RNA sequence: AGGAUUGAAAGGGAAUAAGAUUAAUAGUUCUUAAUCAAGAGAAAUGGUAACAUAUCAUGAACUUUAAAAUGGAGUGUGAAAAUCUACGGAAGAGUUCUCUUUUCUUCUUAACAAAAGUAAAUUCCACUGAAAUGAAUCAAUCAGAGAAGUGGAAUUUAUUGGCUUUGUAAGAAAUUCAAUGAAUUGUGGUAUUUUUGCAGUCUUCAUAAAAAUUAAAGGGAAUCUUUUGCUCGUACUAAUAACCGCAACAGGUCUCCAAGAAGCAAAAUCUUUAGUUAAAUAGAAUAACGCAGGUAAGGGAAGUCGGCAACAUAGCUCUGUAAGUUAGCAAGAAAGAGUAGCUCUGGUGAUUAUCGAAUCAGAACUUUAAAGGUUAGGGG
């Protein structure tokens, strides 16, 4: 086995100091710096992970294409489809009830 | 499969005729030395039996040690499924 | 580095005025046409000798051409 | 330390520069008593405390 | 519009790798190949849907949401690396008068991107509507606020998109050969460990950070090439000699990487890669008294304040286990038997005849009669 050494000057097994050891030409093994695991997005109401958006670092979303950081729907990217459906019915049914209850009952 | 041995600079040290009988009487085709009926005997050119190039170097190095001449001669592959002998 | 897939793009790349250098490598099985552009190094794996010659004529004479073989320069 | 401030590094460099003996010509001056630098130090003998 | 300064070289954080080079520096130099930031040259489609489209396809004020940004335990499992191993080889080395188709070494590949082929897990969408209730895990857990089935969508899996593969890229590097030039660089495993993710389960009178910074939404105000990237640290030790103890002090001082044997074990013991043979001087003789390690006939605590010290037990399997008790324990109670080598036999699966795992049980024979080299409870 080939034993390796930290390349940067950090010497502690911190979250930002994660490494990967990969093989390299000549049988030597080198040290990489791996990225932290991130969370995605959550519905503003039900707190569920949204589908269609990758789990990357906050700044890396700007690098992605304009269509790859959202979902093409009303409140897309901030509310789940189930979250949105309840919003539409609430807005329509309550308004319709207001027209019959009050406003020339 | 056809292994070829070159002695073009050491045939005086080792006559081929002595090598032909040794390979015939020492190859263990099925664990038995001397039962090499499917061996064409310096070349070996045998297809019925299974052998190896690295096996050929084994007896040849064994042969050199038997004659106490191993300290002078070295068996080197000629990159053409054969072996050539140097000093 | 990027890899171009079919023959149409490389000629359009060769005829484009963004080229900087060309290096041709001959392997035991195929021939690679690495085009050194401003940003990337596009390459094209070719296994047909006649199509390779068509490519070599497509190279403008002004650009520098480097031929690589079993011995590196 | 490998890491140091710029001003601290320069003060380190001066202490290296001041750790030298008397040049030979200065020792041949007439009426010269300064033969050895008594302010000298070595890393393993006295820590300069800075 | 809302609250000033400082406070982390282990918290948050835009973006770089492989090879080569020096007497000494190198994610810093060189070759090659990349990335990032700041600049310069009445306004889209598709899908039933989950949602998808090399920049595309306008989006101000104001407001909201999310990320950065969240404990621990234990179980299962995906992938990579190391070790081991199956088949096929190529080159070199070791042994060789006794044998050995033999034993050992090399057979490699980066950042960043591509998308032939092909995965595991979770969550959603469409059709349908479950009772004779079904579906599933090692465990769970779930269903008319809709299970199972079939067909789809998304996310995660150390960069693009997880793995093989591809560009980089063989021109490098490794192993050989010749005297700079030549050769090779397959495919696998229902094995172990490590690393890294994922899934649910358990636990708290414990619920296990904030900002810089980024994106999205609601609203409708308005009508590819190229330049530059400043300041400071960067040598060396990091300890049985570079640090703190007056010193080259058997004391103390926070971390990363981690091979084989054997074993439950990162234990003791031995070895490979690397390091070293010197670390406050030696030679001769082999008295007493010592310090450290031992043994001893017969007796067995009679020694002593006192079994102090030492001796003794010691692993695993099977049988067996009392009084007392807060009913949980005591308990490894106590006590007894087995254990080696060699030659065999049988049980536990996968895939559909071939292949594979260490584990358990049993039987003849032999001997110096078997845990004991090391590790390893004295009991009442």
3-state secondary structure chain B: CCCEEECCCCCCCCCHHHHHHHHHHHCECCCCECCCCCCCCCECCCCCCCCCHHHHHHHHHHHHHHCCCCCCCEEEECCCCEEEEEC
Please say whether the beta carbons of C31 and C48 come within 8 A.
no
Q: Return the closest-CA partner of residue C1 out of C34, C32, C46.
A: C34
Q: Is D42 helix (H, G, I), strand (E, B) or coil?
A: coil
Q: A51 — phi, psi (to 5°)?
A: -100, 145
Strands A29-33 and A19-23: antiparallel
* Contact between C31 and C25 (Cβ < 8 Å): yes
Asked whether residue A77, judged by its CB, lies under 7 Å from any atom of the DNA or RNA strand E, the reply is yes
This entry's atomic model was obtained through: cryo-EM
Burial class (CB in 10 A: 0-12, 13-18, 19+), A93: exposed
Q: Single out the residue of B42, B59, B40 nearest to residue B7, CA to CA.
A: B42
Per-residue DSSP letters for A24-91? -GGG-EEEEEPPPP----B-TTT--BPSSS----TTHHHHS-GGGGS-SSTTTTTS-HHHHHHHHHHH
- Residues A100 and A102: their CA atoms lie apart, in Å, by 6
Token code pair at residue B43? 């070349």
Tokens in use for B83? 């072996």
Compute φ and ψ for C36, nearest 5 degrees.
-90, 105
E strand or H helix at C17: none
Nucleotides of E under 7 A from a protein CB: 9-15, 17-20, 27, 32-37, 44-47, 49-57, 64-70, 80-83, 89-97, 100-102, 106-114, 123-125, 153-161, 166-174, 176-178, 180-183, 195-198, 212-218, 224-226, 231-238, 242-244, 247-248, 254-259
CA distances from A96 to A85, A101, D26 (A): 17, 9, 107
DSSP reduced 3-state for D24: helix
By DSSP bridging, strand C19-26 and strand C45-46 are unpaired
Q: Are D37 and D23 in contact (CB under 8 A)?
A: no
Q: Is the CB of C26 under 7 A from strand E?
A: no
- CA distances in angstroms from C67 to C4, C31, C32, C72, listed in the order given: 20, 11, 11, 9
Q: Are the C-beta atoms of C36 and C23 separated by less than 8 Å?
A: yes
* CA C65/CA C33 separation, integer angstroms: 10
Burial D8-30 (b: 16+ CB within 10 A, else e): eeeeeeeeeeeeeeeeeeeeeee
Question: Comparing C-alpha atoms, which of C47, C49, C54 is closest to residue C14?
Answer: C54
Tokens coding B85: 């002998």
Three-state secondary-structure class, residue A20 = strand
């Amino acid at each position: 086995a080939v034993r390796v050494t930290y390349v940067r000057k950090h010497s502690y097994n911190t979250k930002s100091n994660g490494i990967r050891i990969v093989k390299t030409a000549g049988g030597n093994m080198t040290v990489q710096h791996r990225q932290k695991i991130s969370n995605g997005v959550r519905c503003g109401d039900c707190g569920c992970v949204l589908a269609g958006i990758r789990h990357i670092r906050p700044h890396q979303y700007g690098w992605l294409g304009k269509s790859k950081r959202t979902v093409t729907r009303a409140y897309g990217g901030v509310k789940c489809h189930k979250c949105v459906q309840k919003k539409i019915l609430r807005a329509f049914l309550i308004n319709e009830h207001n027209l019959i209850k009050l406003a020339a009952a | 499969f056809s292994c070829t041995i070159d002695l073009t600079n050491c045939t005086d040290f080792i006559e081929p005729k002595k090598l032909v009988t040794f390979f015939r009487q020492t190859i263990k085709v099925q664990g038995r030395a001397g039962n090499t009926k499917g061996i064409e005997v310096v070349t070996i050119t045998t297809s019925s039996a299974k052998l190896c190039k690295r096996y050929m170097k084994y007896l040849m190095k064994k042969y050199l040690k038997k004659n106490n001449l191993r300290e002078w001669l070295r068996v080197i592959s000629d990159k053409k499924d054969g072996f050539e002998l140097k000093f | 580095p990027k890899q171009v897939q079919e023959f149409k793009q490389i000629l359009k790349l060769l005829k484009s005025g963004s080229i900087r250098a060309v290096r041709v490598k001959t392997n035991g099985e195929n021939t690679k046409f690495k085009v050194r552009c401003a940003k990337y190094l596009y390459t094209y794996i070719c296994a047909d000798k006649a199509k390779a010659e068509e490519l070599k004529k497509a190279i403008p004479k002004d650009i520098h051409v480097v031929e690589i073989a079993k011995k590196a320069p | 330390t490998g890491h140091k401030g710029f001003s601290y590094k320069l003060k380190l460099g001066k202490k290296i520069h001041q750790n030298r003996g008397v040049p030979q010509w200065f020792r041949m001056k007439t009426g010269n008593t300064i033969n050895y630098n008594f302010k000298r130090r070595h890393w393993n003998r006295r820590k300069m405390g800075m």
